[PDB]
Amino acid sequence: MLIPKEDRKKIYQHLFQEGVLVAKKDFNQPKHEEIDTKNLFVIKALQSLTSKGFVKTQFSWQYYYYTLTEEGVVYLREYLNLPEHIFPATYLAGQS
Amino acid sequence: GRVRTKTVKRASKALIEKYYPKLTMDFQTNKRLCDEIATIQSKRLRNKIAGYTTHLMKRIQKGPVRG
Amino acid sequence: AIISKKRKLVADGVFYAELNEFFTRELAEEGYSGVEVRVTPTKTEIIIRATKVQDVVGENGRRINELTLLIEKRFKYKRGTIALYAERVHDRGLSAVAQAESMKFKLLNGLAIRRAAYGVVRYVMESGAKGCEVVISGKLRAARAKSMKFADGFLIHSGQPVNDFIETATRHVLLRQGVLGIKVKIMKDPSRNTSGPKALPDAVTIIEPKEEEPVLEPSVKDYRPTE
Amino acid sequence: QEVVIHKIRINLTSTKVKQLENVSANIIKNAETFKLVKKGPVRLPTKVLKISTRKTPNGEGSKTWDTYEMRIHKRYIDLEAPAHIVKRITQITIEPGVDVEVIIAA
RNA sequence: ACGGAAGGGCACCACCAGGAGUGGAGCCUGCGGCUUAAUUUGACCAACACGGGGAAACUCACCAGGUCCAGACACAAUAAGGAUUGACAGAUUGAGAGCUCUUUCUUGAUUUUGUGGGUGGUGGUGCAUGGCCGUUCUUAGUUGGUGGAGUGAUUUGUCUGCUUAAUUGCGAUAACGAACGAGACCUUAACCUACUAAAUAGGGUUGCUGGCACUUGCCGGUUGACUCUUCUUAGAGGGACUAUCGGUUUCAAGCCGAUGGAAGUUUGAGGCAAUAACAGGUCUGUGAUGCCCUUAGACGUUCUGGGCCGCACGCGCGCUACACUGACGGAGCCAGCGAGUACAACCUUGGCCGAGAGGUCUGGGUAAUCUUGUGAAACUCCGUCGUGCUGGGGAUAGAGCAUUGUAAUUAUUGCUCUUCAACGAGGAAUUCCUAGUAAGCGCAAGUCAUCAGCUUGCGUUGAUUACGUCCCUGCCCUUUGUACACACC
Numbered sequence: 002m003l004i005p006k007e008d009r010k011k012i013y014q015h016l017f018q019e020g021v022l023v024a025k026k027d028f029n030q031p032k033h034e035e036i037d038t039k040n041l042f043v044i045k046a047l048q049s050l051t052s053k054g055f056v057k058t059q060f061s062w063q064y065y066y067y068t069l070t071e072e073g074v075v076y077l078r079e080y081l082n083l084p085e086h087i088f089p090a091t092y093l094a095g096q097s
Numbered sequence: 098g099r100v101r102t103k104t105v106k107r108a109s110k111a112l113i114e115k116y117y118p119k120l121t122m123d124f125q126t127n128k129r130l131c132d133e134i135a136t137i138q139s140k141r142l143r144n145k146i147a148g149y150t151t152h153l154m155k156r157i158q159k160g161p162v163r164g
Numbered sequence: 165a166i167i168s169k170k171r172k173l174v175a176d177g178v179f180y181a182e183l184n185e186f187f188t189r190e191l192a193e194e195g196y197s198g199v200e201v202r203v204t205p206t207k208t209e210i211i212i213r214a215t216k217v218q219d220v221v222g223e224n225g226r227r228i229n230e231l232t233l234l235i236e237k238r239f240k241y242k243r244g245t246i247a248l249y250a251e252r253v254h255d256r257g258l259s260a261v262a263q264a265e266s267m268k269f270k271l272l273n274g275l276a277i278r279r280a281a282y283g284v285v286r287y288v289m290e291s292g293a294k295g296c297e298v299v300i301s302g303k304l305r306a307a308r309a310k311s312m313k314f315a316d317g318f319l320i321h322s323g324q325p326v327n328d329f330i331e332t333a334t335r336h337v338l339l340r341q342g343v344l345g346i347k348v349k350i351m352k353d354p355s356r357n358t359s360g361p362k363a364l365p366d367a368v369t370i371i372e373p374k375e376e377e378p379v380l381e382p383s384v385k386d387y388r389p390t391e
Numbered sequence: 392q393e394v395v396i397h398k399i400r401i402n403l404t405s406t407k408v409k410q411l412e413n414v415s416a417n418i419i420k421n422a423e424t425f426k427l428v429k430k431g432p433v434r435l436p437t438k439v440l441k442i443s444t445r446k447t448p449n450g451e452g453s454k455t456w457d458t459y460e461m462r463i464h465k466r467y468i469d470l471e472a473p474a475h476i477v478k479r480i481t482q483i484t485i486e487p488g489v490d491v492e493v494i495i496a497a
Numbered sequence: 498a499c500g501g502a503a504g505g506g507c508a509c510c511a512c513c514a515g516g517a518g519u520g521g522a523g524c525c526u527g528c529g530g531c532u533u534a535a536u537u538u539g540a541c542c543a544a545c546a547c548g549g550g551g552a553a554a555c556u557c558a559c560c561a562g563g564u565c566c567a568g569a570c571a572c573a574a575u576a577a578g579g580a581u582u583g584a585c586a587g588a589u590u591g592a593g594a595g596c597u598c599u600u601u602c603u604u605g606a607u608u609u610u611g612u613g614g615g616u617g618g619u620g621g622u623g624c625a626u627g628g629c630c631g632u633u634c635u636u637a638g639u640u641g642g643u644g645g646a647g648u649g650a651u652u653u654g655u656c657u658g659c660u661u662a663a664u665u666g667c668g669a670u671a672a673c674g675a676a677c678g679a680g681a682c683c684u685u686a687a688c689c690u691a692c693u694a695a696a697u698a699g700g701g702u703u704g705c706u707g708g709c710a711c712u713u714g715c716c717g718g719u720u721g722a723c724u725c726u727u728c729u730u731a732g733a734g735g736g737a738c739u740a741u742c743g744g745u746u747u748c749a750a751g752c753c754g755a756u757g758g759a760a761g762u763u764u765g766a767g768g769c770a771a772u773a774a775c776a777g778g779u780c781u782g783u784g785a786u787g788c789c790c791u792u793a794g795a796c797g798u799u800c801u802g803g804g805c806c807g808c809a810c811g812c813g814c815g816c817u818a819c820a821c822u823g824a825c826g827g828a829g830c831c832a833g834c835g836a837g838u839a840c841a842a843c844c845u846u847g848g849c850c851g852a853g854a855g856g857u858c859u860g861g862g863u864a865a866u867c868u869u870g871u872g873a874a875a876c877u878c879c880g881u882c883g884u885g886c887u888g889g890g891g892a893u894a895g896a897g898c899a900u901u902g903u904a905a906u907u908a909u910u911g912c913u914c915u916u917c918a919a920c921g922a923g924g925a926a927u928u929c930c931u932a933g934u935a936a937g938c939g940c941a942a943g944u945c946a947u948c949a950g951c952u953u954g955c956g957u958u959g960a961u962u963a964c965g966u967c968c969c970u971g972c973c974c975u976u977u978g979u980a981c982a983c984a985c986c
């Protein structure tokens with residue numbers, strides 16, 4: 002997919018700062034939620050990342066659950082050039 | 098077409114054979130006895146059991162019967 | 165959030181269906197059994213009953229965490245207002261869902277169909293169940309379809325005893341030549357079935373009478389009078 | 392200084408009965424324990440949520456339908472009761488399934 | 498398994514006695530055939546108002562065309578002196594499409610062209626499959642463990658009788674104990690002046706008033722007070738178990754009648770509902786799916802328009818009718834299931850307009866609160882009509898007014914005026930049904946932006962005739978015969 006690099010930057014940076022996406026299956030919608038970009042290339046970008054081996058996908062009731070695996074974290078950190086001591090929001094020990 | 102299938106007949110037979118001194122001729126007293134001395138799950142089955150128990154009691158009172 | 169109460173309950177039910185199917189998709193490798201949705205004044209607790217609880221939690225307790233995040237975005241919840249909880253199944257033998265998933269996994273590894281089915285039945289009856297049954301339908305080593313039936317104990321079929329005691333589970337297994345359909349039925353022990361009836365509808369229990377001695381004819385035994 | 396009675400109202404919902412009735416009974420017991428005046432757990436007509444559905448997913452076969460339904464029981468309660476004990480009662484004794492809602496109506 | 502073989506039992510998807518019908522007519526809808534670019538397709542008791550299939554767009558699957566990649570990933574290849582992307586204006590187009598061209602400008606490694614591979618597919622195969630449902634079969638039928646008989650396939654248990662709706666029981670017994678089915682069980686409908694209670698349900702007394710009567714009474718209004726739960730609700734419970742009695746029964750299972758009852762058909766109605774099976778249907782519900790096909794001008798996806806509705810013709814559900822037990826006017830005025838707006842715009846009261854459809858202004862209702870007492874139709878009372886295809890019938894058309902809709906022509910639908918056709922109770926034949934049942938009558942809900950003549954439910958008025966049989970069509974068990982086992986097709 003041909004994604005302008007700034008919208009792809011938004012996608013990658015959001016996926017990193019928290020770690021998960023839902024991405025309703027309905028294409029052609031104007032804006033994906035909490036991303037302010039088109040849902041279509043959100044879905045396609047996470048599909049490409051999964052094909053890489055960085056995002057585990059899970060389709061159920063059209064809501065494309067996305068989760069970031071460790072090599073995904075490393076790849077995003079190298080791409081986002083953010084310091085190597087910050088982890089996505091999932092890794093935070095928000096336990097019981 | 099009321100035939101009172103296996104369960105009620107066997108239960109009433111055991112009821113008579115284990116509790117004849119306490120059983121009576123009356124349906125309501127034997128109904129309370131069935132409630133107290135046996136754990137019948139529903140209440141329609143309890144009523145059928147008490148009714149057949151009363152019938153068997155009446156037959157026994159008339160005379161000695163098989164089984 | 166204002167909405168009709170009947171519509172609110174329907175939405176709650178469809179949300180529970182949401183959660184159950186999503187967890188079935190995700191935690192299938194975990195021997196998923198069931199999910200409970202408890203609603204408090206502040207938190208929407210979601211208890212997960214699964215076999216591999218420690219793997220469900222994951223390292224440092226992050227897996228559950230990210231799962232929670234998905235829910236918070238699946239239903240537009242708020243942080244803190246929702247929280248997951250992973251619990252071990254009370255007895256993995258009795259839950260037909262877990263057995264169905266486990267023996268689907270066994271089928272996935274090319275294990276013998278008859279051997280896997282009989283092992284499942286044996287384990288279930290070992291758990292204390294009053295009867296188990298498994299239907300394996302599909303292309304069992306032949307082009308023509310056929311259904312194999314394995315059973316032991318007794319399985320009722322009519323009346324809500326079918327709902328009160330026997331629990332069923334249906335699964336699909338993907339092989340290199342087609343799909344196999346798997347149906348698992350377990351009739352739990354009614355005596356141990358809490359929160360409901362504790363016996364079959366026609367199960368009649370008669371209390372054994374106590375034996376007493378009557379011979380004492382006069383027996384005017386006197387207590388000390390009180391006033 | 393919350394002596395002003397809020398004439399507060401507690402309403403309930405569920406798709407099941409025994410736990411709903413249990414919650415209502417506990418609410419009434421709590422209300423009587425601290426000497427509160429009330430209108431009892433007034434029963435509301437159980438709304439039957441019904442869908443008819445054709446059984447066959449493909450239209451073939453003899454015409455066979457089915458009806459699925461829940462029942463919703465409401466059993467609202469209102470209290471002419473003090474402030475803090477009432478809110479404590481609402482925030483305690485909660486059972487999954489039964490849904491509690493509170494209206495001040497003051 | 499079958500018998501135009503026997504015995505014993507059953508069923509209004511059988512009949513008798515009937516009722517209402519359909520088949521005759523218009524129309525609506527679904528098939529076939531024809532036609533067409535397409536008139537998309539699957540079903541042929543158990544296909545045909547069925548796929549929730551009431552499709553104007555979408556739906557969609559068909560047709561004439563126009564777009565785009567929503568071809569991940571790996572490698573090679575170009576390539577940062579441009580891999581590429583996009584576009585004003587014009588030709589082109591149906592388009593205000595940079596689809597394609599004229600010119601040029603913009604854009605930056607996401608891409609582009611080749612290989613592998615992958616996805617998408619209402620593409621094919623239900624004769625590869627799952628799941629589900631239908632049917633065999635609404636009948637009462639199945640099964641294995643020790644034991645007996647057979648060399649054996651198999652058999653007895655599962656039966657001579659009687660009884661039951663029932664392999665339901667009484668029993669007799671090479672059978673004994675058991676399991677599934679039936680029953681039991683849940684929902685629903687009754688009955689509860691017994692309990693708990695209620696300004697989201699009702700009632701009484703008394704206030705504050707209205708009117709009429711004049712005697713202190715009647716019919717009303719008030720969210721003023723006190724009190725109650727008979728009805729209305731819904732929880733725990735009670736109640737019927739063929740209870741008592743009389744007949745009849747190897748006197749046992751049980752049947753028949755009367756009485757008391759609310760209820761005596763299993764109390765009515767259902768929901769689940771066994772073994773075995775069908776090459777029954779569904780890939781067109783599924784991101785359920787194996788294989789095969791396609792994967793760039795695509796069978797992917799989207800846009801425009803058309804079709805799924807055509808019409809020499811046959812058939813299947815129905816609706817309106819052929820009138821006097823009626824049509825049309827007024828007046829009376831009676832329900833029960835429902836449903837109803839939030840990130841959207843639902844149910845609509847009430848007040849003004851319009852003759853109506855409808856319009857407008859406000860106000861309730863996220864619901865025992867408001868629509869709503871859904872003041873519904875049939876029905877009832879008084880009149881007009883008067884046996885005339887007539888004031889029946891309202892199809893087919895002409896014109897106009899509105900609503901939903903981006904869009905209504907191939908009339909969406911509603912309303913107003915007019916033409917008013919066939920239709921005279923419908924052959925052979927054939928369907929459904931034994932009590933609040935059939936039938937008549939409508940209302941609600943699912944389809945729904947608008948549209949039902951459909952279906953699922955609900956209630957109103959409410960019967961004639963059975964209360965039996967194996968004669969037709971079948972079903973269950975037993976006996977017998979068979980040259981049948983793809984099993985009398």
Ligand SMILES: [Mg+2]
Nearest residue numbers: 320321322678
């Ligand atoms: Mg049973």
Ligand SMILES: [Mg+2]
Nearest residue numbers: 322323679680
């Ligand atoms: Mg049953």
Ligand SMILES: [Mg+2]
Nearest residue numbers: 510511928970
């Ligand atoms: Mg017939």
Ligand SMILES: [Mg+2]
Nearest residue numbers: 512513514515
């Ligand atoms: Mg006849």
Ligand SMILES: [Mg+2]
Nearest residue numbers: 517518519816
């Ligand atoms: Mg007719």
Ligand SMILES: [Mg+2]
Nearest residue numbers: 519520521522
């Ligand atoms: Mg006709």
Ligand SMILES: [Mg+2]
Nearest residue numbers: 520521811812
């Ligand atoms: Mg005809």
Ligand SMILES: [Mg+2]
Nearest residue numbers: 528536805806
């Ligand atoms: Mg056609």
Ligand SMILES: [Mg+2]
Nearest residue numbers: 510542543632
């Ligand atoms: Mg049939």
Ligand SMILES: [Mg+2]
Nearest residue numbers: 551552553948
């Ligand atoms: Mg239409």
Ligand SMILES: [Mg+2]
Nearest residue numbers: 554555557800
């Ligand atoms: Mg189109």
Ligand SMILES: [Mg+2]
Nearest residue numbers: 552554556557
């Ligand atoms: Mg179309």
Ligand SMILES: [Mg+2]
Nearest residue numbers: 560561562563
């Ligand atoms: Mg085209």
Ligand SMILES: [Mg+2]
Nearest residue numbers: 617618619781
């Ligand atoms: Mg598809």
Ligand SMILES: [Mg+2]
Nearest residue numbers: 618796797798
């Ligand atoms: Mg397509």
Ligand SMILES: [Mg+2]
Nearest residue numbers: 623776777778
């Ligand atoms: Mg088939």
